[PDB]
Amino acid sequence: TTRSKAIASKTKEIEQVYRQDCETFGMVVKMLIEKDPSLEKSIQFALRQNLHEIGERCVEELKHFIAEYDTS
Amino acid sequence: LTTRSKAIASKTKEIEQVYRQDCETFGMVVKMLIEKDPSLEKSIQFALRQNLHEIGERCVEELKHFIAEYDTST
Amino acid sequence: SETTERTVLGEYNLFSRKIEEILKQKNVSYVSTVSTPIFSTAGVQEFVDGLHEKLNTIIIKAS
C-alpha cells in the first residue's frame, strides 16, 4: 500500500550491499587463485559458506525490518 | 613549496590510501575464508602475501609513472 | 577457471530468490532491479609501512 515504497527501498539497499560483498569475495578469491592455482577447487567451500551465511544475515535483516515496521 | 612537490606529495597520498584500502579488504576476506576452512591457512596466507607484494610494486610503478609524465610535459 | 564467478553468481541468485519469497509472502511489493554481480573494471600493516618507505624514498630521490 503506502508502505510498499519503503520496503522496496530497503530491499534495494540490502541487495546492493550483498552484491558488493559478492563482487569483493570473488575478486579476492580469483586473485588468490591466480597466485596459487591449487586453491581453485578447495577454496570454493569456504567461499560458499561465507557467502551463504552473509546472505542469510541479509535476509534476516529484511525480515526484522518488516516485523518492526508492522508494529503499531 | 612548488606546484610539483605538491603534486607528487598528493599523488603519493592518494596511492597510499588506495593501497591501504586494498590491503584491508584482502585481509578481511582472507580472515573470513580461513575462519570457515582453517586447513587453508597456510596456502591462502601465502597467496595473500604474493598479491599484496605485487600490488605494492604496482603502486611504486604508478608513482614513478606520474613523476616521469609530469617531468616530460609541464 | 570460472568456478569462482559461477559460485558467486549462484550465491547471488539463491539470495535474490529468497528475497523475492520474503517480499511476496508478507506482503505484496514489487520487482527489485539491482544488477547481478560482475568481476571486471594476518597483519597487513607491514605492507602499508613497506610501501610508505619505498614511496618516501622515491619522493626524496625526485628532488
Numbering used by the authors:
A (entry chain A): 295 to 366
B (entry chain B): 294 to 367
C (entry chain C): 1014 to 1054, 1072 to 1093
List sentences quoted exactly from the publication behind this structure.
Thus, a crystal structure of a Periphilin fragment spanning residues 292–367 bound to a TASOR fragment spanning residues 1014–1095 was determined using the single anomalous dispersion (SAD) phasing method, with bromine as the anomalous scatterer. The structure contains two Periphilin molecules and a single TASOR molecule. The Periphilin fragments form helical hairpins with a mixture of α-helix and 310-helix secondary structure. The two Periphilin hairpins pack against each other via a 118 Å2 hydrophobic interface formed by the hydrophobic side chains of Leu326, Leu333 and Ile337. The resulting Periphilin homodimer has twofold symmetry. The TASOR molecule forms two α-helices that wrap around the outer surfaces of the Periphilin dimer. The TASOR helices add a third helix to each Periphilin helical hairpin to form two three-helix coiled-coils. Unusually, however, each Periphilin subunit binds to a different TASOR sequence (residues 1014–1052 and 1072–1093, respectively) with an identical binding surface. Notably residues 1055–1071 of TASOR, between the two Periphilin-binding segments, are disordered, but these 17 residues could easily span the 35–40 Å trajectory needed to connect residues 1054 and 1072 in the Periphilin-TASOR complex. The 2:1 stoichiometry of the Periphilin-TASOR core complex was confirmed in solution by size-exclusion chromatography coupled with multiangle light scattering (SEC-MALS) and non-denaturing mass spectrometry.
